[PDB]
Amino acid sequence: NVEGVKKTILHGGTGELPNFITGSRVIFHFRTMKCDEERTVIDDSRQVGQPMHIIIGNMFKLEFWEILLTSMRVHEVAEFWCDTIHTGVYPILSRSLRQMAQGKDPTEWHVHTCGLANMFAYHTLGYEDLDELQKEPQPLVFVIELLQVDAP
Amino acid sequence: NVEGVKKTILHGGTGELPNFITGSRVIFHFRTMKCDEERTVIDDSRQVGQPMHIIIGNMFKLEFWEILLTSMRVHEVAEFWCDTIHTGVYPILSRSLRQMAQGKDPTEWHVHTCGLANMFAYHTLGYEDLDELQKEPQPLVFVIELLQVDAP
Ligand SMILES: C/C=C(\C)CC/C=C(\C)CCC=C(C)C
Ligand SMILES: C/C=C(\C)CC/C=C(\C)CCC=C(C)C
Numbered sequence: 001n002v003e004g005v006k007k008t009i010l011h012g013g014t015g016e017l018p019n020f021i022t023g024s025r026v027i028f029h030f031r032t033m034k035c036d037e038e039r040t041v042i043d044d045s046r047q048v049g050q051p052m053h054i055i056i057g058n059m060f061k062l063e064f065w066e067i068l069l070t071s072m073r074v075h076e077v078a079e080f081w082c083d084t085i086h087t088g089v090y091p092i093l094s095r096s097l098r099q100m101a102q103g104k105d106p107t108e109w110h111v112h113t114c115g116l117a118n119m120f121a122y123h124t125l126g127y128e129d130l131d132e133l134q135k136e137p138q139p140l141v142f143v144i145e146l147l148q149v150d151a152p
Numbered sequence: 153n154v155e156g157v158k159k160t161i162l163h164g165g166t167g168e169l170p171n172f173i174t175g176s177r178v179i180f181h182f183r184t185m186k187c188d189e190e191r192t193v194i195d196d197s198r199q200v201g202q203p204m205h206i207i208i209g210n211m212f213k214l215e216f217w218e219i220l221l222t223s224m225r226v227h228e229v230a231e232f233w234c235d236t237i238h239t240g241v242y243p244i245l246s247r248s249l250r251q252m253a254q255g256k257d258p259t260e261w262h263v264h265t266c267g268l269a270n271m272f273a274y275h276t277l278g279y280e281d282l283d284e285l286q287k288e289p290q291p292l293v294f295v296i297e298l299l300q301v302d303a304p
Contacts, residue, residue: 092268107259116244119272120286134272 002067004083013075013146020070022059023152028052028069029145032090034138035081042129042140043094048101051147072146080142087140091130098127154219156235165227165298172222174211175304180204180221181297184242186290187233194281194292195246200253203299224298232294239292243282250279 001007020026029051034040045052056066068080099106099115106112118126125131153159172178181203186192197204208218220232251258251267258264270278277283 089265089269092265092272095268096265107261107264109259112259112264113241113244113248116247116268116271117241119268120244120275120277123272123275125272 001071004085005067006081007068007071008079008081009076010079010143011075011077013073013077015073017072018074018149019151020056020059020066020149021151022056025053025055025150026066026069026146027148027150029147031143032094033141033143035141039141042090042133043097050101052097068142068144069146072144074146074149077143077145080144081139082142083139084137088137090140091125091134094130095125095127153223156237157219158233159220159223160231160233161228162231162295163227163229165225165229167225169224170226170301171303172208172211172218172301173303174208177205177207177302178218178221178298179300179302181299183295184246185293185295187293191293194242194285195249202253204249220294220296221298224296226298226301229295229297232296233291234294235291236289240289242292243277243286246282247277247279 029045031044031046032042034042041047054065054069056062056070062070064086068078072078095115096106099111104111106115118124125134181197183196183198184194186194193199206217206221208214208222214222216238220230224230247267248258251263256263258267270276277286
């Protein structure tokens with residue numbers, strides 16, 4: 001559907017596209033991997049236990065992840081191959097998820113400011129994988145399972 | 153009252169200490185200056201037009217600025233000299249205020265992430281003064297006027 005983005009369904013879900021209206025919360029699992037042989041995992045919501053929650057802000061102005069998610073039926077499991085053009089911000093995104101996974105609030109001031117502090121002082125996202133990933137740009141495969149969609 | 157912090161009242165305000173209870177919003181003006189001869193201004197809420205708003209989070213665990221503000225009567229104008237120990241985070245704080253001053257939301261995702269992006273890519277807070285200030289640590293004088301205190 002979009003440039004530098006190959007989607008492949010793995011397990012079609014029940015029903016047709018749901019109502020991805022602005023302010024909906026989309027609940028899902030993802031596993032993020034490199035495109036090497038070992039297919040190296042970088043993040044996995046199943047590994048951490050809890051599933052992921054986003055909330056569509058502007059259905060007419062979507063974020064790249066929302067492009068991916070909004071193309072999915074409930075209980076769909078889909079593999080999204082993604083060209084460099086769209087993987088650049090992933091490490092900062094991941095950094096933010098990993099902080100939320102420890103109940104640190106990545107948009108609370110005290111953690112936001114410590115984050116900029118360290119980032120600036122030490123030239124690191126905090127994790128070796130994300131830093132390697134930051135210094136060696138590349139495509140990524142996300143495997144995603146859409147679990148629930150709820151409206152405002 | 154505290155180490156590496158010299159306060160001097162300039163114009164005593166009406167009444168005695170107000171109720172700085174947790175969740176209060178404190179409304180004030182500040183002007184932030186170096187301790188050189190020219191007394192170089194770095195930030196001034198009067199220059200930008202609007203006064204500043206903070207909201208006490210934990211009255212038993214206060215932030216250094218809250219230490220300063222919570223020691224003030226309404227309409228007080230006070231000068232707070234501050235030793236290196238407490239000025240290190242100022243440039244990141246300032247960066248955040250300058251973004252809020254352009255109605256950019258410094259804890260919204262899209263701006264938070266662009267911010268980390270640039271900070272990491274370019275090794276800058278975005279403004280030459282804050283970067284100079286970041287590479288040459290020092291004390292600072294804040295002059296502050298407390299305007300209003302409102303409770304939850
Ligand atoms: C309300 C919006 C947010 C809190 C931003 C969260 C963003 C993500 C969780 C990225 C989605 C993960 C992928 C692997 C595409
Ligand atoms: C609700 C809390 C915040 C939005 C953080 C805002 C912090 C400041 C505005 C710093 C105060 C300015 C000084 C010069 C000490």
